[PDB]
Structures are given as C-alpha cells and as structure tokens.
Amino acid sequence: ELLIREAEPKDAAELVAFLNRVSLETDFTSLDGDGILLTSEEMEIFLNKQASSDNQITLLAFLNGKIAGIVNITADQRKRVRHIGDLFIVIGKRYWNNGLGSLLLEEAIEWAQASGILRRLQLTVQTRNQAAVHLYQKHGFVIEGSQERGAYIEEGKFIDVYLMGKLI
Amino acid sequence: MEYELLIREAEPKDAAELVAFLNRVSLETDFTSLDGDGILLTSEEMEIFLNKQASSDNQITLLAFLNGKIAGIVNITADQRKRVRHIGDLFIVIGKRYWNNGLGSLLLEEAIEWAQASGILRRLQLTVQTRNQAAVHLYQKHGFVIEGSQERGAYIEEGKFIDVYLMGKLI
Numbered sequence: 001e002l003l004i005r006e007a008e009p010k011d012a013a014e015l016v017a018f019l020n021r022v023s024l025e026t027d028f029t030s031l032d033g034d035g036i037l038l039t040s041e042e043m044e045i046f047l048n049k050q051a052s053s054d055n056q057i058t059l060l061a062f063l064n065g066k067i068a069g070i071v072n073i074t075a076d077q078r079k080r081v082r083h084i085g086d087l088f089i090v091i092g093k094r095y096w097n098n099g100l101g102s103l104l105l106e107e108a109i110e111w112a113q114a115s116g117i118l119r120r121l122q123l124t125v126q127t128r129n130q131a132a133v134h135l136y137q138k139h140g141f142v143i144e145g146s147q148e149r150g151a152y153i154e155e156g157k158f159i160d161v162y163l164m165g166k167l168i
Numbered sequence: 169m170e171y172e173l174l175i176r177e178a179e180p181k182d183a184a185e186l187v188a189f190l191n192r193v194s195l196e197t198d199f200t201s202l203d204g205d206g207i208l209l210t211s212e213e214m215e216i217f218l219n220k221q222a223s224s225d226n227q228i229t230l231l232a233f234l235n236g237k238i239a240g241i242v243n244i245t246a247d248q249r250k251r252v253r254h255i256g257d258l259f260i261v262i263g264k265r266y267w268n269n270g271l272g273s274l275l276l277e278e279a280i281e282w283a284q285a286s287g288i289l290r291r292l293q294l295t296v297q298t299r300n301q302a303a304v305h306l307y308q309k310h311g312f313v314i315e316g317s318q319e320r321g322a323y324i325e326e327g328k329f330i331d332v333y334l335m336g337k338l339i
C-alpha cells in the first residue's frame with residue numbers, strides 16, 4: 001500500500017526521523033552521520049514554506065502509512081533564476097529497486113510542469129552514483145557538465161560529480 | 169593619473185556602504201542574479217551577513233575602496249557539511265565606471281590566495297552567462313576552466329532564457 005502526496009506540517013517529526021535514518025544509509029548525498037540537523041519544529045516551518053511556495057514542493061511517499069521516500073524541489077526567488085528548481089530525492093534503502101524513485105520523480109516533474117513558473121529542473125550527482133544517474137536519465141535529465149572535487153567522502157577522498165538538467 | 173586604493177576584508181561597519189554599492193551595481197547590468205529590485209537587504213541585515221563571513225573559516229567578503237568608496241567586491245560563500253565544505257562559490261562585481269583597469273583581477277587573485285591559505289577550500293566555482301565574455305575571460309585568466317553549460321541558466325529581458333557556463337578551479 002503506497003500513497004504519494006505533498007508534505008503537510010504534521011509530517012515534520014516523522015520526516016526528520018526518516019532523513020536522519022537515510023543519512024546513515026549511504027554517502028551519496030550531502031547527508032552524513034550528523035543527520036539533517038533540523039528540529040521537528042524547524043521542519044514544520046520548512047514544510048509550510050514549501051506548501052505556500054508557487055515554485056517549490058516537497059512530496060512524500062508513504063508505505064503502509066510510514067514515509068519511505070521524499071522528493072524536494074527548492075528554488076531561488078529572484079527573477080533571474082526563479083524558474084529553476086533544484087531537485088533532491090531519497091528512498092529508504094530497504095525499498096530501493098521497486099520503482100518508488102521513478103514514481104516520485106514523475107510526480108515532481110508533473111507538478112513542476114503544471115506550476116507555470118518552473119522551466120528547468122536540475123541537480124548534482126556523484127558520478128559513481130550510477131543508480132541515480134540512470135534514474136535521472138530515464139526521466140529525461142541530461143548530463144550538462146562534470147566537476148572535479150564536487151564531493152568529499154571517507155575522510156579524504158575527493159570525487160567527481162555530474163550536473164544534470166531537464167527543461168520543462 | 170591619480171587614485172587611492174584599499175583592498176581588505178569587509179567589516180560590520182561597512183554594511184551601509186556595501187548595501188549601497190550592491191544596489192548601484194544591480195542596476196548597471198543584467199549579467200548576474202542582481203536586478204532592478206536590488207540587493208533586498210537593509211544595512212542591519214547586511215551587518216549580520218558580514219559578521220558571519222568574518223567569523224567563518226571557509227567564507228570571505230573582500231572589498232576594494234577607490235578614493236574612499238567601495239568600487240568592487242569578491243565574495244566566497246560555502247556550505248558547512250563535510251561533503252561540500254571545501255567548495256567556495258565565487259561572486260565578483262565591479263562598478264561599471266571602473267571596468268577594464270585591472271580591479272577585477274586584483275580582487276580575484278586576492279580571493280584565490282585567501283582560499284589557498286584557508287586550509288579548507290580545495291575548489292572554487294561559479295556559473296557565468298555564456299554571453300558575459302569579459303567575465304568568461306577574466307576567470308579563464310586566473311585558472312578557471314569551463315566544466316559544462318546549462319540551458320535556461322538565466323532569465324533576462326522579461327522573456328529571454330539564456331545559457332550559463334559552469335566554471336571551476338582546484339586549489
């Protein structure tokens with residue numbers, strides 16, 4: 001049983017818990033053992049901001065009533081760049097490779113298309129993170145550049161990232 | 169041929185003049201995310217930003233005063249998580265009136281030297297509109313290479329999307 005819907009402030013405590021869990025599952029994102037470093041009350045503030053924002057959104061995936069994944073679009077408000085959404089997605093490791101990430105990413109893209117503001121979606125992905133690269137390409141993201149020392153892992157060493165975007 | 173030059177780290181006391189300068193340059197070009205709305209920060213809010221930059225070991229704001237007035241700024245910004253703590257996002261702007269006299273280069277080099285000495289930053293980066301060739305040139309001169317380009321990186325002229333270069337330097 002799977003529901004995908006937009007985050008509500010009542011999800012804050014459980015979202016913080018989810019993000020601290022996934023922070024310990026991999027080193028593919030900026031999240032590390034220090035976790036999300038946000039209180040449930042800070043996260044409420046965040047989720048309210050996202051919900052009222054015309055060019056930003058947090059969508060949550062629930063598996064039998066518990067959050068199993070999140071996709072985030074954030075965006076700057078200045079007119080130069082307000083049409084650009086920066087994407088972030090993470091799925092609980094035990095649920096990988098069952099299509100949740102594609103489901104969530106497709107919902108995000110649909111929302112972004114409907115927004116009327118967002119005309120570009122983008123992100124940075126570690127080149128070694130081939131699952132992410134493949135998923136993003138599958139949904140029409142292209143590799144737009146590659147950057148040396150785009151990330152630091154394992155207490156020394158530096159690794160490369162790709163930049164990826166999709167026009168909408 | 170006569171002038172007075174000071175280059176130094178910004179202090180909270182500079183807040184009002186720095187707000188004034190950033191509002192000035194935001195009206196001179198549409199080459200950066202600055203626009204006619206201006207910097208959108210009061211002198212009081214800038215004073216906070218400026219305390220943080222001075223108090224942070226992987227960030228900095230450097231000012232150039234020409235004849236006692238701010239003529240240019242270089243800004244290094246950075247996240248604090250260890251995944252990305254070594255990456256400084258660079259921003260430079262010079263008053264149009266003072267372009268092509270070497271001021272941009274002096275500031276860029278000072279910023280690079282600080283970044284090198286910090287012991288934390290191992291990469292500098294920015295994005296630059298592909299049409300902003302003065303900027304593309306200035307950065308190449310100081311060892312930045314083009315790592316990519318992004319369609320719709322910027323929106324101008326109420327309806328025109330344009331491309332940006334991703335540019336980077338290892339330090």
Ligand SMILES: CC(=O)SCCNC(=O)CCNC(=O)[C@H](O)C(C)(C)COP(=O)(O)OP(=O)(O)OC[C@H]1O[C@@H](n2cnc3c(N)ncnc32)[C@H](O)[C@@H]1OP(=O)(O)O
Nearest residue numbers: 028088089090091096097098099100101102130131132134
């Ligand atoms: C800024 C950001 O978005 S953060 C970067 C992305 N997030 C992360 O890296 C966090 C950790 N990882 C995750 O949360 C997940 O593994 C995600 C988000 C990458 C993928 O979530 P999932 O729900 O597993 O995705 P889903 O099942 O829809 O699809 C995975 C696809 O990758 C493929 N895949 C899995 N592992 C690999 C691999 N090592 N190499 C290539 N492809 C792979 C699968 O075959 C599948 O493709 P298909 O549908 O064509 O078969």
Ligand SMILES: CC(=O)SCCNC(=O)CCNC(=O)[C@H](O)C(C)(C)COP(=O)(O)OP(=O)(O)OC[C@H]1O[C@@H](n2cnc3c(N)ncnc32)[C@H](O)[C@@H]1OP(=O)(O)O
Nearest residue numbers: 199259260261262267268269270271272273301302303305
């Ligand atoms: C993220 C960011 O940094 S923002 C992007 C940069 N900032 C901006 O676009 C804001 C508006 N522009 C400016 O502030 C300035 O014009 C800057 C910062 C780009 C340059 O600063 P200046 O003080 O003019 O730089 P400086 O005089 O040291 O060097 C200018 C160089 O570009 C050259 N130049 C000037 N116009 C052009 C052009 N159209 N095409 C190519 N080169 C040019 C000059 O010849 C000189 O190069 P050289 O010394 O090798 O001959």
